[PDB]
């Protein structure tokens, strides 16, 4: 049994898989090899397979801000990207955002289009950021040492120091 790699396919015998860009049309026999037929126009198959039909290419919806980076072939799917300077939300680039924001407890290090998405940092001790923002940096804690004020409430990465007398 066992069956070799990049050949795989077992069913009383060991058959060769179809090369990427080819669908499976007929199984192999004792004396005949596996029969594979190429994928049709607008269709693909990206791996050594035993698939009887090819998959359709994904479309880069202009209304989603998508633009085709690489036209799909019979072995690879269409690769999409954003308009620029729009940024992909996933590695798959299935949606675009102008830029990402930095949630409370995080501050910005800017967004300059073309790979340059917002760089966030986690607010060091003595700094805070309430609000979700794509421009706001971490702000420093009040003082409570200026007018020789108290301290009253600690001060978080999300909240500021609150002071009395």
């Amino acid at each position: 049994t066992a069956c070799r790699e990049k050949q795989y396919l077992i069913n009383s015998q060991c058959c060769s898989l179809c090369q990427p860009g080819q669908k499976l049309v007929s199984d192999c026999t004792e004396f005949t090899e596996t029969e594979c037929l190429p994928c049709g126009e607008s269709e693909f198959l990206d791996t050594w397979n035993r698939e009887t039909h090819c998959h359709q290419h994904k479309y880069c919806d202009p209304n989603l801000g998508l633009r085709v980076q690489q036209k799909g072939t019979s072995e690879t799917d269409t690769i999409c990207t954003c308009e620029e300077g729009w940024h992909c939300t996933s590695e798959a680039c299935e949606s675009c955002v102008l830029h990402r924001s930095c949630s409370p407890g995080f501050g910005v290090k800017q967004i300059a289009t073309g790979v340059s998405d917002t760089i966030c940092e986690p607010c060091p001790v003595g700094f805070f950021s309430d609000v979700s923002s794509a421009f706001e940096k971490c702000h420093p804690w009040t003082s409570c040492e200026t007018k020789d004020l108290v301290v009253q409430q600690a001060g978080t990465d999300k909240t500021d120091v609150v002071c009395g007398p």
Partner: nanobody
Framework: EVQLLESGGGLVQPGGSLRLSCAAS???????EMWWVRQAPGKGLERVS?????????YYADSVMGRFTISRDNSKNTLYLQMNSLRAEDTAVYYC?????????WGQGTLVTVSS
């Protein structure tokens, strides 16, 4: 449901000034961070300015600092951009964007042309 309707954009002479507005509807405008972005024809997308919900904190691009002013009327649910000392580089289509800045979270645009 988000509608952002830019206006104020027209043909102005260099050195001149314009006031752009973005009328928001379909969301609680007073609670969202807003941005102004411009796109020159052919040339790249550029982030001009940004404002926090209360209108107390702002950001400006180095290329527009000192000449441009972002502001908001949370009663009327409108965002503004006062453009002064206008130059030909400022010729672009101006858009306004709503956080979380999806391709659905921005307007139709308003054309600003700076020439003689």
């Amino acid at each position: 449901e988000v509608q952002l309707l830019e206006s104020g954009g027209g043909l102005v002479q260099p050195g001149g000034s314009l006031r752009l507005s973005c009328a928001a509807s379909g969301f609680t405008f007073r609670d969202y961070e807003m941005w102004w972005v411009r796109q020159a024809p052919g040339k790249g997308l550029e982030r001009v300015s940004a404002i926090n919900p209360q209108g107390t904190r702002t950001y400006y691009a180095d290329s527009v600092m000192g000449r441009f002013t972002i502001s908001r009327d949370n009663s009327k649910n409108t965002l503004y951009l006062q453009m002064n000392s206008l130059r030909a580089e400022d010729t672009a289509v101006y858009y306004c964007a709503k956080l979380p800045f999806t391709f659905d979270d921005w307007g139709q645009g308003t054309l600003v042309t700076v020439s003689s």
